[PDB]
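Structure, all two chains, one model.
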Amino acid sequence: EDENEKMFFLIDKVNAFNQDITALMQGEETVGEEDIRLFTRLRHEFHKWSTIIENNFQEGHKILSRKIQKFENFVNYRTFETIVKQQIKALEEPAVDMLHTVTDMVRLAFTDVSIKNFEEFFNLHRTAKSKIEDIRAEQEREGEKLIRLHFQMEQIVYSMEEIFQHLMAYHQEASKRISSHIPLIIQFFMLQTYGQQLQKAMLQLLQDKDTYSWLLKER
Amino acid sequence: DENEKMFFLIDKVNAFNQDITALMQGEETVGEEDIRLFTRLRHEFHKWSTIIENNFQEGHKILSRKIQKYRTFETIVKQQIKALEEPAVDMLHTVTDMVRLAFTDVSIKNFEEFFNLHRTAKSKIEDIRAEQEREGEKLIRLHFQMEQIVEIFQHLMAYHQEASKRISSHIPLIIQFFMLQTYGQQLQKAMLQLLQDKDTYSWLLKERSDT
């Protein structure tokens, strides 16, 4: 059958693209002659982040102690809580900057997989392509959102000696958490999720039999 | 809707492919004193290895003993290699069985509400099994026929010694690749074949209650 023959060529191609996606998610993908894999380049960006947050932590502890003394030279429960809360908010804007760089890295990987299977490609292809692009846009929007949400999470804590001790606990834990999560979000949205959603849409092209021969030409 | 039918089927197929990857990479959920697929293969190979090494010792001394006393001498090395062939093909068969069981379970989960549609999917699982297992077996036998190509005593003893050592490793190789790596990948491509006839969609969705 010539119907069977036609099935082999198209059906074989679509899977191969998806298999390379799996390599991309795991820091295993095949890369150009003197390029660096996506996973390694991300690691460098995260180290710069670590430093910024550490400085914040030392600042906060002193601020409350001194606040009491200076005014001299627990009815104000609302006022003292406010000071620690505001130190953590100062970290927010830096976090989003890092996000942007990383999604640029990922796009380069992903595009080389697609092109590889499909480049001798002009009426048939494209449609597929557009799924690659739309999902780029979408995910980067989402990633920024989650970072900002994370910071509003951080607005919740953790005699005169018991209020002091308690409230200060909150500051310390808060710093470590910010350091770890801002790098995480970036990877989660723009490598794992990005890849997987593409795959399902790519299976959709197979439906139309009488669009068979209509799909195949390679000229 | 025509629009509903399309998206429901497209989505299900794409999830099926993800599960096949897990099975292939030795991370499926298993029992406590049970053992994972990938380890299971290794136990089978160890048994193979010990039998082969016996054969290597016999060859060397036989040819020597007759020289204390041309084609009559070359006949003995070729008969020694030959004896390993029939055991090899046996072990191919059992490893195939174990991998095959995992794959079929994924097909079932996705298409229980499409009775006609499920039948074709499952059939693709078997087709890929058939084809590769034939090839596997073929390559074992070809390997032996290859081995059957061969004062003069000293030059000829180097070929006797070397030969045997090869067989030990190769039979395992075929068994590993054949019905693990290929089995998965090519299977996936057959599954999108269901998509073709949207005029057939109503037929696929025919239920058991009114046949």
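Chain A has seven helices and no strands.
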